[PDB]
Design a binder for this molecule. Structure first.
Ligand code: HEB
Ligand SMILES: CCCCCCCC(=O)O
Ligand SMILES: CCCCCC(=O)O
Length: 393
């Protein structure tokens, strides 16, 4: 069928171990052919850094309109000029300057979460820390109560899940799970939107209902698209940033110790986690016209999957591509994308990661619980684990 290839795993990724560390496979594929058509998924894969960046930089050539006849009327799936107008509503809300005032409060949220576990021998960094903290932050930004964090996590995670394979049964099981998260989350936000239409508040949702574009209010679908995209993007990725950073720091305790002993290295650590364990592995696009990249001729309308996970380790751009380095003078990864769709939340994600890692490090040395069976999140464009247990020494 005409299915989104970014939800369907490559055939080159087979075992669970490979899902937990697919980067050697991506590097082999990059070397064999940095651009290849995958007949199992009816798409091109692009693995090299230069071409990924070129795709993201050329929205006129590679369109973001890739909704799978799905309910995603958000800027993520829009092209200029509509993308420009809707994004200009929110861009000033997510700058470094706009968020600086949240620093103390995010530190307070992290302190409170680590207090719920101080007297716990071992704990799940996902359930007890990395999961809650991003959800709490984005809910306060949106103006939405989320006191049942586990409920919203479940359905937010649903909207990112992919297919086990390219079969018909796997795709149907995937759409069933995605549809459940749409029902609850669309419904919840429709109710909050109606509540804000009746009585405005000092929150993002209320601002979106007052804002005018081309002399008219936003459609309900458009406000809903903002609400869900901001919710899901705001928490699912950031949780994997924190978890993946804690994963690497308990796989390589040398790095953990170094950064704990020189806390000014936390920003580099955040960037290197994003490069080395990118929460988002692949970004989709649709060819807007025929495009000749190499010898490879991309025909208008074909799916084009750009692998940030591979671009981040392209040795043509990165020294020591497969080594975790906390002393890099620059780190031009594409884990937040590039160009007009560049991650709106990157300053917020970077602040949350910086505070999350700092609070963990300051609480002392910590180790992974050995003899656990890690479970990768079931989505091929995501990289993270469902659970990750650690303990303080
Ligand atoms: C708050 C909020 C938020 C947050 C926190 C975030 C966080 C994040 N994120 Fe973001 N993003 C977002 C919001 C967000 N986000 C949005 C809204 C978007 C869309 C934009 C446009 O489209 O323009 C993005 C976008 C984006 C992109 C691009 C895509 C394309 O190109 O298409 C990427 C890659 C990302 C990633 C990410 C990560 C990795 C993280 C963590 C770490 N993001
Ligand atoms: C983080 C990926 C984008 C999430 C927003 C799209 C919601 C949906 O699937 O309907
Ligand atoms: C938060 C947006 C990540 C990009 C997901 C995709 O391109 O399918």
């Amino acid at each position: 069928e005409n299915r989104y290839a970014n939800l369907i795993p490559m055939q080159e990724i087979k075992s669970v171990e490979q899902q937990l560390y697919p980067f050697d496979i991506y590097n082999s594929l990059r070397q064999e052919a940095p651009i290849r058509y995958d007949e199992s998924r009816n798409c091109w894969d692009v693995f090299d850094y230069e071409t990924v960046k070129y795709i993201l930089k050329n929205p006129s050539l590679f369109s973001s309109k890739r909704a799978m006849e799905e309910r995603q009327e958000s800027i993520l799936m829009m092209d200029p000029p509509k993308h420009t107008k809707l994004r200009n509503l929110v861009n000033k809300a997510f700058t470094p300057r706009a968020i600086q005032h949240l620093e103390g409060h995010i530190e307070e949220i992290a302190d409170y979460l680590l207090d719920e576990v101080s007297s716990k021998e071992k704990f799940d960094i996902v359930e007890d820390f990395a999961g809650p903290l991003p959800i709490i932050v984005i809910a306060e930004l949106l103006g939405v109560p989320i006191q049942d964090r586990a409920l919203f996590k479940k359905y937010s995670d649903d909207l990112v899940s992919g297919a086990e394979n390219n079969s018909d049964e796997a795709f149907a099981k995937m759409m069933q799970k995605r549809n459940e998260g749409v029902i609850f989350l669309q419904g919840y936000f429709k109710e909050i939107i109606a509540e804000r239409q009746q009585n405005k508040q000092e929150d993002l949702i209320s601002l979106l209902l007052e804002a005018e574009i081309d002399g008219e209010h936003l459609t309900e679908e458009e406000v809903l698209g903002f609400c869900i995209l901001l919710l899901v993007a705001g928490n699912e990725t950031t949780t994997n940033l924190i978890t993946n950073g804690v994963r690497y720091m308990t796989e390589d305790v040398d790095v953990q110790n170094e950064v704990r002993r020189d806390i000014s290295l936390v920003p580099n650590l955040v960037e290197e986690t994003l490069r080395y364990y990118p929460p988002i592995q692949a970004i989709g696009r649709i060819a807007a016209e025929d495009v000749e990249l190499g010898e490879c001729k991309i025909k208008r309308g074909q799916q084009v999957i750009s692998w940030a996970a591979s671009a981040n380790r392209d040795s043509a751009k990165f020294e020591w591509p497969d080594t975790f380095v906390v002393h890099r003078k620059t780190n031009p990864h594409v884990s937040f994308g590039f160009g007009i769709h560049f991650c709106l939340g990157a300053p917020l994600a970077r602040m949350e990661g910086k505070i999350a890692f700092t609070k963990l490090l300051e609480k002392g040395g910590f180790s992974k619980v050995q003899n656990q069976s890690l479970k990768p999140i079931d989505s091929p464009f995501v990289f993270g684990v469902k659970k990750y247990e650690i303990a303080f020494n």
